[PDB]
């Protein structure tokens, strides 16, 4: 089910069939100031049966950071970059508002007590966890970050803004969607990132692992990256590593960064891609 | 393209690889005998159309005039009032009206909520979308959302087709919608066609060529009692896709009326009955 396999397939597709954007996108390369151009494809999907962790081996993926951001969003449910800073992460400071938050985005949405459960207002994460055990057959296991009533109050809108869970035959399946995704930098980080969430949720609810589905709306690549991306497609692919999660954790809110450990993560080498600002 | 071919493919997929929910206590029941209405399903299904044909089912008839009427009520009128739908000669939503005659804060109510700031004025999801398609094409945020997290409990009923994403690339306007769950026998044919029409209405009033139409389904299923007829329908003779005519003179989204729509040469199979699940 290798991520390398499907990644390569999409990337190759975008290169030989992508649609170029130039009065469209203004993205000066933070390096020489020149404009960044993309090639994009619409509606792509990668499916994994969870027989292995979906992660890249042709290029190293920052697994630890993926999990720290994940926890900050889903567990702590905060929009405060400070909390994330205390976790040793600084990749969100560029969106830090006056109060240190990112407006009413990401974690803020997950923490709003807007669902009436047993006479009390509960948030999206709580409601879900409860309904996954006490109402598996439901066709409405949905988390939504794209709140239309507050899009203006968000220092930044989410790429991966939704997920739908399904309990089919004792198995927990997860489907997430990214409205936009940078295949070179953002994608690998996000695919692995949400698989961990599935594995976390499945453990605390007591379900076996179902299928993992990642949907991308606007699938794009920066032209400057194409050369390396083509080099990456020739790099050797190894067997997926093993992800260890503390089997003793039974409460979602009890997972810590220490409870996760990737085991035997063999990868390609350094091949960094420039970031466009 | 051809809705019939892709539809049959999903239906057959369900029949052969579906997973039932027979061991669960389901909220759905048969209106006839009250017994639990079980489904058989597949997860994550997508149907893509290049718009060289209007995606419509020919193996049985699709209630196209109601599809469009419903569309106008939700999108154009942005109404949650069932009485407005009644005046259009539709009574299928009557079962869902609360005392106030509205279906709560669902569908049209979300689309008509003035929540986006635009030129020092608050607009709704539809106005904002229309402006942005012309003024800010290429944005990766051309998204409408019916699934409002804050409003979920104040909705008489939760939407199946709850979102859309539009893509303007080289003049062509592309549309991708998503249904969280879709009953393949009764709701799907209706919903798919319905959204294609919305693509055409918008592409006409924004002056874009028709791009791809993509329909994604989360929980793709069929109710167990519908399998024998679905089996029949699959063996039926398919017909050439009809032609949809939309008044070429309408330049504004809100100027459309049901009369501006007319299907020409719509040939289809005989009546197939399907028990209603509640």
From Swiss-Prot, chain A:
Could you describe the subunit structure of this protein? Homodimer.
Q: What does this protein do?
A: Catalyzes the reductive methylation of 2'-deoxyuridine-5'-monophosphate (dUMP) to 2'-deoxythymidine-5'-monophosphate (dTMP) while utilizing 5,10-methylenetetrahydrofolate (mTHF) as the methyl donor and reductant in the reaction, yielding dihydrofolate (DHF) as a by-product. This enzymatic reaction provides an intracellular de novo source of dTMP, an essential precursor for DNA biosynthesis.
Indicate the principal place this protein occupies in or around the cell: cytoplasm
List of residues binding dUMP: 139-140, 179-182, 190, 220-222
Task: State the InterPro entries in the record.
Answer: Thymidate_synth/dCMP_Mease (IPR045097), Thymidate_synth/dCMP_Mease_dom (IPR023451), Thymidate_synth/dCMP_Mease_sf (IPR036926), Thymidylate_synthase (IPR000398), Thymidylate_synthase_AS (IPR020940)
Q: What is this protein called?
A: Thymidylate synthase 1
UniProt entry keywords in alphabetical sequence: Cytoplasm, Methyltransferase, Nucleotide biosynthesis, Transferase
Query: What Pfam families does the annotation carry?
Result: Thymidylat_synt (PF00303)
What are the EC numbers? Answer: 2.1.1.45
Family membership, please give it: Belongs to the thymidylate synthase family. Bacterial-type ThyA subfamily.
Catalytic center residues:
159
């Amino acid at each position: 089910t290798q991520f390398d396999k499907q990644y390569n397939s999409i990337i190759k597709d975008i290169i030989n069939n992508g649609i170029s954007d130039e009065f469209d996108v203004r993205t000066k390369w933070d390096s020489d100031g020149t404009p960044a151009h993309t090639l994009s494809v619409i509606s792509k999907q990668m499916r994994f049966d969870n027989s292995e962790v979906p992660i890249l081996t042709t290029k190293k993926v920052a697994w630890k950071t993926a999990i720290k951001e994940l926890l900050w969003i889903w567990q702590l449910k905060s929009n405060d970059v400070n909390d994330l800073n205390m976790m040793g992460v600084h990749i969100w400071d560029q969106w830090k508002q006056e109060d240190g938050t990112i407006g009413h985005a990401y974690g803020f949405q997950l923490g709003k007590k807007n669902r009436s459960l047993n006479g009390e207002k509960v948030d999206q994460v709580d409601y879900l966890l409860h309904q996954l055990k006490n109402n598996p057959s439901s066709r409405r296991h949905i988390t939504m970050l794209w709140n239309p009533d507050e899009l203006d109050a968000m220092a930044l809108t989410p790429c991966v803004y939704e997920t739908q869970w399904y309990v089919k035959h004792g198995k927990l399946h997860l489907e997430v969607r990214a409205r936009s995704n940078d295949m070179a930098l953002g994608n690998p980080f996000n695919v692995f990132q949400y698989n961990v969430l599935q594995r976390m949720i499945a453990q605390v609810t007591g379900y076996e692992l179902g299928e993992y589905i990642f949907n991308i709306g606007d699938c794009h690549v920066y032209t400057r990256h194409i050369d390396n991306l083509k080099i990456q497609m020739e790099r050797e692919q190894f067997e997926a590593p093993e992800l260890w999660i503390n089997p003793e954790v039974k409460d979602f809110y009890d997972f810590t960064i220490d409870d996760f450990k990737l085991i035997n993560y063999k990868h390609g080498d350094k091949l960094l891609f420039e970031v466009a600002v």
